[PDB]
Amino acid sequence: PGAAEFAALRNRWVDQITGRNVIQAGDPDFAKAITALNNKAADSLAKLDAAAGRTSVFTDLSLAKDAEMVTTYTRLSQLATAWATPTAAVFGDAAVLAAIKAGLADANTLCYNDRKEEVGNWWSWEIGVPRALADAMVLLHAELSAAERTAYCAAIDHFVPDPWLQFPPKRGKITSVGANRVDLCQGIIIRSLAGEDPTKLNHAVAGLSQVWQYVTSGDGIFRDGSFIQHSTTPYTGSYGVVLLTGLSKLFSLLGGTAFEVSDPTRSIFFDAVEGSFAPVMINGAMADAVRGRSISREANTGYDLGASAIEAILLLARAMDPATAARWRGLCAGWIARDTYRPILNSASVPRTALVKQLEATGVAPVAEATGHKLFPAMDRTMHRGPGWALSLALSSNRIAWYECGNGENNRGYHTGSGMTYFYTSDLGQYDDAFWATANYNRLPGITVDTTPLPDKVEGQWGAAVPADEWSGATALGEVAAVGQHLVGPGRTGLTARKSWFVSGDVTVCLGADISTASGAKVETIVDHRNLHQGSNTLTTAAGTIAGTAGTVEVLGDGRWVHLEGFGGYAMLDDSPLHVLRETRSGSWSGVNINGSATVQQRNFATLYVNHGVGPVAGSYAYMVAPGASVDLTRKLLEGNKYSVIRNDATAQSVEFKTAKTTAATFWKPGMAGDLGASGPACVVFSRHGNELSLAVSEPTQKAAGLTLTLPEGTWSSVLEGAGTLGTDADGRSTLTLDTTGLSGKTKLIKLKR
Ligand SMILES: CC(=O)N[C@@H]1[C@@H](O[C@@H]2O[C@H](C(=O)O)[C@@H](O[C@@H]3O[C@H](CO)[C@H](OS(=O)(=O)O)[C@H](O[C@@H]4OC(C(=O)O)=C[C@H](O)[C@H]4O)[C@H]3NC(C)=O)[C@H](O)[C@H]2O)[C@@H](OS(=O)(=O)O)[C@@H](CO)O[C@H]1O
Ligand code: NA
């Protein structure tokens, strides 16, 4: 493994991270990318510490604070990037070069060297600095001496002697997993190019293989496409994207070389592009329900993370078979074209710009997001789509935490796992336009909530506690899904609620039952809490309009429906009062993240809710949401028994969709909902077509070995599709007995003939 091969690998990495070989002359998007590169470099140079015998490299960054030590090194690597990028203002500038070299030398002497013990966050010492210092060594290889390489390699190896492990010796070292394994292996691989160390490079490449093996618990990719990091938090949209980015860059770097990734099981990672990442991408944004504590970050948004996933997918597509390459390019062209709110080229790097330009040059057409249901039972998440909308549900259970907070981020997010209903629509900024700085964290859309105030960081950091609930889970057949959550409230209030969602191709029916608490406070259920930006969007009712005055809550008259201009319709399925509030809310990103700006953002909201009162005894609700419905269509929702409630109590919750001729149900106890029965916890959807009955079924606790259904629509004597055993009960009804051992909440599809 020789000098020529190492020089070629370093030159490829510099090509990848600068775009120096792919800048198109006179292209306006390249010029904008260089301007952004120039402005960041100039900002850093303006902050250089010029003092004799300096103790920092930048006047605004202390080397005694571990996060500011990381930013010292990322500024130095950005400066080296600019120095290596043709047409940048500092390209080849010897004075700027000397300042980068002196910054790397003094940061090494003063702080980050092979005699230093870690202080503070392990991630700073083992991932933040190594990736940036390794990039700077490679960018500056022709300029650093052999003695400088020896010093900086020794510092990296001191903190990361083995990238299969993490934490300083005093803590006890553990296996690194998922995004952390990828980031540690990346820093050692790039450091092995600077120091020409084939032994360390080979071991780091071999370390990538663990991250795409299927798991059934802990962190990683599950067979249903879920991705978990930190044991208990759904995490495809942030840690999953870190993993996707780092593998795309390392696979591209090493391809065709002596160090190429050759493990055939990497097919599992490729299958995750459509199995894991695509269903939670919504018009260019990663869904908030799968990005954990990053919702609290003003400048690490669902669109920032979706744009990074698009860049990685485009980079990986270059190596794939023709059909797969074109499918991934079509998905990306669609997420790019539909996103007029944060266009991907605004503030894009040179490499990102080149990949987006290459995609446009293929002429590959944009692929629409498919209607229908994508369920992720391993991480208590579901996605549902129809024309103009995508619903993301955020549940929690004895497997999945209420929320992750940590490092001063998302400390207020404790209700985000209480049955949230995110309706994404053509309002592309709904959840991005200062929503997380201004929203009422006690009235998030869809939740049931005990109004007892909870402290920041209630239930602990890092998802350490989970609700001891009965089950959360889901199933779907064709166009209809059934989703259930036994909500146990955070903060030991004793709040309990049975929340179910029955989701068709257009409307979502929301049923709640068995609601009580021990706290003595009122309990609410939030029909919506919806960002109006600076708008005065009209709320129309049967009688006229409601909540025309900001700050004055009103109760809906008798028609039972309300339409929100720019959104769609809501309607009540019982005779409970609906409270409607137009409100103006203010807050700063500093109020939800220690790193957030102090700038105050002010936003208008529409807030619709039911009040279960103090001391509810088996409190309940029933309502529906029709995203995109007109006033006329909203007025008609409650006519003709289109959405026919069957049962809504502590035993079962069920609705029939008249038009779709399909019935959906959740079961909490053994019992009957209309003419369907279950022997235990179940999600069921069924539809008869003439002499054939179709069923989807899940066993949502993930722990029962069997489940028996009492079948609707008459008697059934054979099985056409699927597995299960037919039987007959005491009352002459047909039964279906399923073996559910080890099914992990997955759906079984069955078809019976009369
Ligand atoms: C303090 C401590 O010991 N806590 C551990 C906890 O470790 C923490 O969790 C993560 C981790 O990597 O596991 C680490 O998260 C990453 O933090 C950095 C800054 O430190 C970035 O956050 S940001 O600066 O606020 O944006 C990073 O964000 C991502 O960065 C990048 C990138 O650099 O490539 C790209 C993405 O766009 C962006 O989202 C952030 N990662 C994410 C995805 O948020 C913390 O720094 C680290 O303290 C866990 O440790 S673990 O190893 O067991 O996982 C935790 C597990 O329960 O245990 C705590 O004790
Ligand atoms: Na956790």
Q: What is the 3-state secondary structure (H, E, C) of 527-579?
A: EEEEEEECCCCCEEECCCECCCCCCCCEECCCCCEEEECCCEEEEECCCCCCE
Helix (H, G, I), strand (E, B) or coil at 306: helix
The residues pairing with 285 across neighbouring beta strands, listed in sequence order, are 282
> DSSP label at 366?
P
Residue 218 one-letter amino acid: G
Residue 161 token pair: 């002697």
Which residue, judged by its Cα, is nearest atom 16 of ligand 1?
A: 123
In this chain, the answer to whether the domains covering 1-369 and 370-640 adopt an identical fold is no
CA of 295 from ligand 2 middle (Å) equals 16
230 lines ligand 1 (CB under 6 A): yes
Which residue, judged by its Cα, is nearest atom 51 of ligand 1?
A: 230
The residues pairing with 281 across neighbouring beta strands, listed in sequence order, are 286
How many residues in the chain? 754
Residue 330 token pair: 């079509």
238 lines ligand 1 (CB under 6 A): yes
Q: Which of 544, 537, 604 is nearest to 567 (CA)?
A: 537
Which residue, judged by its Cα, is nearest atom 6 of ligand 1?
A: 462
Single out the catalytic residue among 230, 399, 498, 603. 230
Residue 499's Cβ-side half-sphere holds a number of Cα atoms within 13 Å equal to 33
Q: Which of 730, 698, 733 is nearest to 713 (CA)?
A: 733
Q: Tell me if 302 sits within 8 A of 289, measured CB to CB.
A: no
Q: Which of 510, 514, 417, 426 is nearest to 467 (CA)?
A: 417
CA of 233 from ligand 2 middle (Å) equals 6
291 lines ligand 1 (CB under 6 A): no
In whole angstroms, how large is the CA radius of gyration of the chain? 28
Measured on CA atoms in the order 308, 312, 317, 318, is the torsion positive or negative? Answer: positive
The residue to mutate among 242, 304, 308, having the most atoms of ligand 1 within 8 angstroms of its beta carbon, is: 242
C-alpha–C-alpha distance, residues 396 and 233, integer Å: 9
Architecture of domain 1-369: Alpha/alpha barrel (1.50)
Q: Tell me if 718 sits within 8 A of 734, measured CB to CB.
A: no
C-alpha–C-alpha distance, residues 696 and 684, integer Å: 6
Question: Where are the domains positioned within the chain?
Answer: 1-369, 370-640, 641-754
Q: Tell me if 510 sits within 8 A of 517, measured CB to CB.
A: no
737 lines ligand 1 (CB under 6 A): no
294 lines ligand 1 (CB under 6 A): yes
C-alpha–C-alpha distance, residues 313 and 277, integer Å: 10
Give the experimental resolution in Å: 1.5
What determination technique applies here?
A: X-ray
C-alpha–C-alpha distance, residues 546 and 681, integer Å: 40
CA of 266 from ligand 1 middle (Å) equals 24
Single out the catalytic residue among 73, 152, 235, 239. 239
Strand intervals (E) in 671-729: 671-673, 676-678, 682-689, 692-698, 706-710, 718-721, 725-728
180 lines ligand 1 (CB under 6 A): yes
Which residue, judged by its Cα, is nearest atom 50 of ligand 1?
A: 230
239 is catalytic: yes
Helix (H, G, I), strand (E, B) or coil at 156: helix
CA of 399 from ligand 2 middle (Å) equals 10
Which residue in this structure is represented by tokens 């050692």? 188
Roughly how many angstroms between the first and final C-alpha of the chain, as a whole number? 69
C-alpha–C-alpha distance, residues 689 and 193, integer Å: 64
Q: Tell me if 483 sits within 8 A of 465, measured CB to CB.
A: no
Q: What does the angle CA 249 – CA 251 – CA 257 come to, to the nearest 5 degrees?
A: 120
232 lines ligand 1 (CB under 6 A): no
Ligand nearest to the CA of 232: 2
> What is the number of helices (H) and of strands (E) in the chain?
16, 36
Q: Tell me if 693 sits within 8 A of 720, measured CB to CB.
A: no
Assign domain 641-754 to a CATH class.
mainly beta
Strand intervals (E) in 341-479: 372-376, 381-386, 389-394, 420-424, 448-450, 472-477
CA of 123 from ligand 1 middle (Å) equals 7
Measured on CA atoms in the order 673, 676, 682, 688, is the torsion positive or negative? Answer: negative
Single out the catalytic residue among 293, 385, 530, 612. 293
The residue to mutate among 69, 70, 122, 123, having the most atoms of ligand 1 within 8 angstroms of its beta carbon, is: 123
List % helix, strand, coil for the chain (3-state, nearest 5): 30, 25, 40
Residue 550's Cβ-side half-sphere holds a number of Cα atoms within 13 Å equal to 11
CA of 68 from ligand 1 middle (Å) equals 15
CA of 230 from ligand 1 middle (Å) equals 10
| CB atoms inside a 10 Å sphere around CB 84 | 21
Q: Does domain 370-640 have CATH number 2.40.50.140?
A: no
Full 3-state SS string of 708-724: EEECCCCCCCEEEECCC
CA of 464 from ligand 2 middle (Å) equals 5
492 is catalytic: no
702 lines ligand 1 (CB under 6 A): no
The residue to mutate among 407, 436, 461, 595, having the most atoms of ligand 1 within 8 angstroms of its beta carbon, is: 407
Full 3-state SS string of 15-66: HHHHCCCCCCCCCHHHHHHHHHHHHHHHHHHHCECCCCCCCCCECCCCCCCH
293 is catalytic: yes
